[PDB]
Amino acid sequence: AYTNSFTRGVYYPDKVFRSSVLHSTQDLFLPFFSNVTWFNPVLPFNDGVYFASTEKSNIIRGWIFGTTLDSKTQSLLIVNNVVIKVCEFQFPFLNCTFEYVSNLREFVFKNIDGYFKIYSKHTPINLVRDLPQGFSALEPLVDLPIGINITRFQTLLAAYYVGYLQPRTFLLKYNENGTITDAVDCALDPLSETKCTL
Amino acid sequence: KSFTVEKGIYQTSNFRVQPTESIVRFPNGSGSGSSTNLVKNKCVNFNFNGLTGTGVLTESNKKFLPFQQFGRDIAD
């Protein structure tokens, strides 16, 4: 199945504060109104992943990232007390080089220059299916320079939504408090292209 | 380039307040260096976690987000 992304998949591209200003940025984003797969099978990672999940009892809690996923290479396991491991575990439901120990949940996972970055945002909802209408930027939570090559990933236990990021240009609107309240996808349509131009 | 000056107002030089001292600061742990005391309301050469510059540091009302470390203006 598939569903409409609407305006989801927006995150703060940096840690820079801005106030009541429109800023043009070029980065990996989830294209507005794109087809996101709606649902576990092993899924490709590509250049980035937008993940979303509706939860009533915290069913989906684990994520696996890697290329082989057979203990031959580094495998990134994240289990929500958030525990993040890179052990070459042999593999799923319920040579270590790193270990860290700490409603709609939205996450952005990407790997740039050996830095695995995880952004997240949680919000209560009045619906139980499909991504609801609205806008909210995802804040960074994890930035680990592990260097794991990732070409596939899987979830570990409920339906969840998966989309893929693309190198697009976005016009972000920072309010007086530095919160991104609106975004324009420059490539969506001619009107948005005009907005970006001006 | 004259030995005689007519009545008027002439733009001659440029005034530039010079920095007093260098302020280097790192987190409460060890930012791979020794931190210095913070000096406010004075032209100083500041260095915050490797971000270097020269200017006057004043107490701000701007509300950075928890993950936000620096602030940029319209000209970036």
UniProtKB/Swiss-Prot annotation, chain B:
Effect of T52K: In strain: Omicron/BA.1
Region (Disordered): 16-28
Result, substituting N28Q: Reduced viral infectivity
Glycosylation (residues): T20, S22, N28
Quaternary structure and interacting proteins, as annotated: Binds to host ACE2. RBD also interacts with the N-linked glycan on 'Asn-90' of ACE2. Cleavage of S generates a polybasic C-terminal sequence on S1 that binds to host Neuropilin-1 (NRP1) and Neuropilin-2 (NRP2) receptors. Interacts with host integrin alpha-5/beta-1 (ITGA5:ITGB1) and with ACE2 in complex with integrin alpha-5/beta-1 (ITGA5:ITGB1). May interact via cytoplasmic c-terminus with M protein. May interact (via N-terminus) with host bilirubin and biliverdin, thereby preventing antibody binding to the SARS-CoV-2 spike NTD via an allosteric mechanism.
Function according to Swiss-Prot or TrEMBL: Attaches the virion to the cell membrane by interacting with host receptor, initiating the infection. The major receptor is host ACE2. When S2/S2' has been cleaved, binding to the receptor triggers direct fusion at the cell membrane. When S2/S2' has not been cleaved, binding to the receptor results in internalization of the virus by endocytosis using host TFRC and GRM2 and leading to fusion of the virion membrane with the host endosomal membrane. Alternatively, may use NRP1/NRP2 and integrin as entry receptors.
Protein name: Spike protein S1
Full-sequence portion shown in this chain: 304 to 571 of 1273
